Design a protein around this ligand. Sequence first.
Ligand code: LZY
Ligand code: LZY
Ligand code: ZN
Ligand code: ZN
Ligand code: ZN
Ligand code: ZN
Lengths: 360, 360
Amino acid sequence: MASMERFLSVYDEVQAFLLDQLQSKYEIDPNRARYLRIMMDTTCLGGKYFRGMTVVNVAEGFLAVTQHDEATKERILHDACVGGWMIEFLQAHYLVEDDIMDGSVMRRGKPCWYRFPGVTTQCAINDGIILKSWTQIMAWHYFADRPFLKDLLCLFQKVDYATAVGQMYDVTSMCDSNKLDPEVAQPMTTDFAEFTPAIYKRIVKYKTTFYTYLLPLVMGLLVSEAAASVEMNLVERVAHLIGEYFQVQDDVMDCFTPPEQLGKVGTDIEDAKCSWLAVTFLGKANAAQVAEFKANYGEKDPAKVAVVKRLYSKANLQADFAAYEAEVVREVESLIEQLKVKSPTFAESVAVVWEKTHKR
Amino acid sequence: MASMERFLSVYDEVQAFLLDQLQSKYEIDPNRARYLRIMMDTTCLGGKYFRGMTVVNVAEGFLAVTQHDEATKERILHDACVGGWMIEFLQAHYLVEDDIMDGSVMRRGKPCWYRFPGVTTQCAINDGIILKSWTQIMAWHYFADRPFLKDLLCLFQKVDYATAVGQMYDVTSMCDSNKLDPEVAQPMTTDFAEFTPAIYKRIVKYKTTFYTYLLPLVMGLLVSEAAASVEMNLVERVAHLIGEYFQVQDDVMDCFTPPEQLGKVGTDIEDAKCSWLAVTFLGKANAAQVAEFKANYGEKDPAKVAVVKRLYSKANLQADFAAYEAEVVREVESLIEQLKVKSPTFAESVAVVWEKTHKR
Ligand SMILES: CN1Cc2cc(F)ccc2NCCC1=O
Ligand SMILES: CN1Cc2cc(F)ccc2NCCC1=O
Ligand SMILES: [Zn+2]
Ligand SMILES: [Zn+2]
Ligand SMILES: [Zn+2]
Ligand SMILES: [Zn+2]
């Protein structure tokens, strides 16, 4: 069976399971079950399934070099699909909540969930809670007797928690640290002293790389019982590197990709986000460029946003990006090589993850 | 050592642990650690700690009848305190999110977290995420080698999930079920056909009773390794009964308790909530009373809210409440008795839970 149709089939199975359970054990009525079915479909489906499919691809890699009964191959691939859906639903939780937090309009060319007319924020905040709760229900049901259950649940929590901490680093990225204070409304930075590579890297490492790259890779290893085929520090290092690159591309596209192609009107400039473009621009600007950037950044006014875009275009940030891209190619290839000392197969899965990231 | 000072001491310990961990493993800076410290204190502290202290009281009960080394008594009480804080932090997560969902103003005579000037909804939604994530971090750290870890984490998830499903039942309680639909803005019910005792009971069972009563009782049993001293169906039945009673009192107080004493301006009438008062009023009203109630319920207009209050006062709902209260006294005493077949101690803890509920 091809991997993607397996993966999509298991979505239907897990949906049925969750909704059947709500009816037998949580007293749900058919109309609220329908509401939850629609919510799940709307929030979990229509992406590329990169994260969840990575769990399946890692597991397929190991299957090709490990002796197993056919039933065992099937069980492992079914666990990989379940595990992939936990990651997709964890993503779904964060997109629902982040779109409410950020007052976002669209996502993927469709309205954010909370903006649907029969949803509203009141329900959507709790729908997003449910999305994440479903990841646990899946796990406890499908993995109750599995030897990797403990390790999988402990990994998943950590990644969830890293993610939430990353969200805090992101939403507070335009504030001056020494001014954080629940009692006092937070001004935007005026010096941009915290728009540094190291501070950027911290935001991205926690907000994206743990759930997007580390967790799919390591879930593949756990459902395969293959964590001893790898040096976990190397898996972490490569995940964080690749994940950083992924976000740098997202940052660049928020600004320069046509909204119809983006799926989204990009607002990083108005939102005063600590983007790769802002940081890299500040890393090369002269005094006058820095002052013009300060006078225009983090303002809804379209005349000012267009000044920030003009500054970025004039500053030749494509040069810095190809330099960055070169260095990431270097380091990711070094790490892949180090990953072959213990697992050629695993290193090859990492290669494929890198290729899918480095092209899109 | 007295139970409450133990419990409060363990709060400080767990706080220190969480913030120290953020610094050593999650790259946090001191100012964001301070923000999280303040958030934790503001959201987790200043209640009565009923839920978390119930875990400690159940555990104390078992200690008084079970032979153990002093070090083991200390370990059990420390686990009970940790477990109690997981419940308090789970509550904190739901109050933060529910206050944002409901557009609430105050809670306990202080502003809702999201309304603090340096917080805002953008941060508060994610602060509430973190609150719940901290419950898992506590568990994995303090209970990593404990034999009850699996059972505790599986119970906790279920209770979390019941809670979220209860929140969905509550936020959708004024809608007609057959009209739920993400695509279509939801009208308030005009017939109130779903304002029934059974429908009310379902809302309350899931939204409150699992986290408020079931989880503290069963956590006490798990940290005591005492789940075999009870018939779990009886613990569930008693939890749900007592929990229902608790919410009926909250419902009555939302309407009739002075806001300065309530901690809150009560808005259940304006919010068109399926409250015990609404249901019980509809269960006894004549046609004219039902029509006046329909013309006035679920409106912000203070003239209409005062009409709904007048209808409730005229309808002598105190009578129905003392009748309800009588029946709950009957059934809770029956269940306590059934709980003595297997554990006098456990039954006595349930008695104390009932006494603290039935007086406040
Ligand atoms: C717990 N902590 C952060 C972390 C979070 C995760 F999600 C996954 C891995 C790691 N490990 C790196 C450092 C550490 O020990
Ligand atoms: C899982 N489900 C609902 C439930 C949720 C909980 F939080 C705790 C207990 C129960 N048990 C009653 C019925 C059932 O088996
Ligand atoms: Zn965001
Ligand atoms: Zn972006
Ligand atoms: Zn609410
Ligand atoms: Zn209330």
